[PDB]
């Protein structure tokens, strides 16, 4: 209880930051104070609110969080963090309406006293920014923004930094924000990880880390980018015997290192861990809920493949079902929760809860992806709900850098998926050792420019069918979209898509290869658009609906506008 106060219950003062801001814009309160608590991180020791009211009416009762500030410094190849200042608690609201709200800060302590601070008033201008990311109810294969333009997520996972910190993301993050990028994964468990609140207790959070979280949350703030913060991974609930990575022995929860469990099955049922993890996302609420920047919470990494001892299928669904429920409760901005699996085709007892907004896919698979690509998602259309294929790469033990220096492989997959009717890229492991140092932040420019300028939301896409190719010289297959408006088309080569020594194509496209016919009534626009350098290759009016496919070497993309 490093952090305990024994002194009667007193506000000693209030910071502001602007008393007027943007919609959606941060505004962020710091209330330094005494109090008795042995812990500043259990609301049963000190409970910090802030209640707001926009001029409508409406109400949010944000909770408060406890706060370290630090500078931060690289010391050669490590970050370090010096601490300035006591620390102290803070407020983050976000409002979605303009106008005027009215807030007060209300604070109770373990004693049962409560103290408050006047009523003060602040103004919200209109802003830019498009709001929080939800569902869209117009297709519920993609995201939107509350202000109705779609969220379609280009990116990668960027998990965790190397001992440097947020100074790689500095890195990383523009490289792929002016690369199309708008979406990332950030792991906030094990307790190895950058952003880990839980690194020496269950209890308590690092401050620390969660300063480091603000500032690459900041970041993407800035970028225009979305992110997926991951609660858990299943290291934590693995043991050393089983292998894969495994982090039982290490973890804060297991009572051999302080924690309430003895094993990693009773994770899903003490009451003490369910009531620490009921505090750890009420802390995640208060620090990061205001941010429209985060995309979505996930509440595990893989959670099949925690300890075969520990995974009781109607366990892991209950703890999800309640979790989720109460997470969707103290966070005055909802946003989206899901969780993963490591095996491919989910989980459905799970994936089918409601308080699951959308599902995922993990797939490391070496041969024939592109097909188990299409196979996963057209299943997963079950759901009635957004499909994001959350990893992906080959089944190589990590050589994918070694085995495809070029991004082949990532760059069949994200076309695959985005043409497939998934909610966005695929997205790639290995941004550490691949795609940044193996510069492959092209593949993603050249993507995003194709998708861009159409509104999926609108267009009724389905996946293509009803179609025949008539080539002779070459095995050319399809991957595609047919909507009200445009057909989108991804060609590949099947002898040459799956081969990765040669250098990126750059090559003439003058010859005629065959054709493809599709159902569909002319007069028809054709764009033909090369996907390694992003950029329009050729455009042809037809009256026809047999499309001529030009020559290419690996795949080429095609964009049909019904005319
Ligand atoms: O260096 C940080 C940390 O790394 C841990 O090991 C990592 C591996 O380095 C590798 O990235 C591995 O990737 C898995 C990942 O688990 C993911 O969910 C997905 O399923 O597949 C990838 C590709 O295999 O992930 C582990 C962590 O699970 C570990 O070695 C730590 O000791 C070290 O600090």
Same mark, same amino acid.
């Given at each position: ?6 002194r009667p219950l007193n506000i000693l003062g209030i910071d502001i930051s602007k008393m007027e801001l943007g919609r959606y814009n941060l505004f962020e309160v710091s209330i330094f104070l005494q109090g008795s608590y042995l812990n ?19 109400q949010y009762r944000v909770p408060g969080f406890f706060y370290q500030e630090y500078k931060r410094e690289l010391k050669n190849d490590y970050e370090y963090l010096v601490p300035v200042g006591d620390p102290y608690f803070k407020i ?36 830019? /920014? ?7 109810? /117009?297709? $519920? ?16 996972? @960027? ?41 020496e207790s269950v209890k308590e959070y690092d401050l620390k880390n969660a300063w480091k979280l603000d500032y690459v949350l900041n970041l993407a703030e800035k970028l225009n980018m979305y992110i997926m913060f991951c609660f858990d ?20 929860? %297991? ?17 003490? *861990?369910?009531? %620490? ?26 959670? #099949? ?32 929760? +899901? +969780? ?30 592109? #097909?188990?690509?299409?196979?996963? @998602?057209?299943?997963?259309? /079950? ?43 695929? *997205?790639? $492991? $290995? ?9 492959? %932040? ?43 408006? %445009? ?19 750059? *090559? ?15 007069? @028809? ?11 329009? @290759? ?26």
């Amino acid at each position: 209880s490093r952090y305990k106060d024994n002194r009667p219950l007193n506000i000693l003062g209030i910071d502001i930051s602007k008393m007027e801001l943007g919609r959606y814009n941060l505004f962020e309160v710091s209330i330094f104070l005494q109090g008795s608590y042995l812990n500043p991180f259990d609301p049963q020791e000190i409970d910090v609110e802030g209640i707001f009211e926009d001029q409508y009416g409406n109400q949010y009762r944000v909770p408060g969080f406890f706060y370290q500030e630090y500078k931060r410094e690289l010391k050669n190849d490590y970050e370090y963090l010096v601490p300035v200042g006591d620390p102290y608690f803070k407020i983050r609201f976000s409002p979605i309406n303009i106008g005027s709200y009215k807030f007060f800060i209300k604070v109770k302590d373990k004693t049962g006293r409560e103290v408050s601070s006047d009523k003060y008033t602040i103004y919200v201008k209109e802003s830019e /920014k498009p709001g929080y990311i939800r569902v869209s109810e /117009k297709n $519920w294969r993609y995201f939107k923004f509350d202000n109705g333009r779609q969220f379609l997520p280009i990116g990668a996972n @960027i998990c965790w930094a190397t001992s440097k910190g947020t100074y790689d993301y500095d890195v990383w993050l523009p490289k792929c924000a002016e690369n199309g990028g708008n979406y990332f994964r950030v792991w906030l468990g094990p307790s190895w990880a950058t952003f880990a609140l839980e690194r020496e207790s269950v209890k308590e959070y690092d401050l620390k880390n969660a300063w480091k979280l603000d500032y690459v949350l900041n970041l993407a703030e800035k970028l225009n980018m979305y992110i997926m913060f991951c609660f858990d991974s299943y290291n934590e609930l693995r043991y050393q015997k089983e292998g894969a990575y495994p982090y039982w022995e290490h973890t804060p929860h %297991y009572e051999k290192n302080g924690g309430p469990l003895k094993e990693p099955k009773d994770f899903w049922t003490n009451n003490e *861990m369910i009531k %620490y993890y009921k505090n750890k996302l009420r802390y995640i609420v208060a620090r990061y809920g205001y941010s429209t920047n985060v995309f979505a919470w996930e509440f595990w990494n893989q959670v #099949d493949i925690i300890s075969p001892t520990a995974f009781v299928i109607g366990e892991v669904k209950k703890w999800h079902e309640d979790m989720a429920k109460y997470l969707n409760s103290i966070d005055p901005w909802k946003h989206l929760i +899901t +969780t993963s699996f490591a095996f491919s085709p989910g989980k459905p007892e799970i994936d089918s809860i409601s308080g699951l907004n959308f599902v995922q896919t993990h797939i490391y698979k070496s041969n024939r992806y592109i #097909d188990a690509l299409l196979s996963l @998602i057209a299943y997963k259309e /079950k759901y009635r709900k957004p499909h994001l294929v959350g990893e992906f790469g080959l089944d190589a033990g990590g050589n994918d850098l070694w085995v495809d220096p070029n991004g082949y492989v990532i760059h069949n997959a994200i076309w695959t998926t985005i043409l497939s009717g998934a909610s966005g890229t695929a *997205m790639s $492991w $290995w941004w550490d050792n691949h795609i940044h140092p193996n510069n492959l %932040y092209f593949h993603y420019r050249a993507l995003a420019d194709f998708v861009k300028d159409i509104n999926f939301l609108e267009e009724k896409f389905e996946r293509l069918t009803n179609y025949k190719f008539n080539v002779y010289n070459r095995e050319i297959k399809v991957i595609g979209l047919q909507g009200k408006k %445009y057909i989108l088309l991804w060609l590949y080569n099947a002898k040459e898509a799956y081969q990765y020594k040669k250098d990126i194509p750059n *090559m003439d496209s003058s010859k005629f290869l065959g054709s493809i016919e599709l159902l569909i009534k002319p007069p @028809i626009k054709v764009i033909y658009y090369d996907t390694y350098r992003g950029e329009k @290759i050729k455009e042809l009016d037809l009256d026809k609906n047999v499309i001529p496919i030009i020559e290419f070497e690996r795949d080429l993309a095609i964009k049909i506008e019904l005319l």
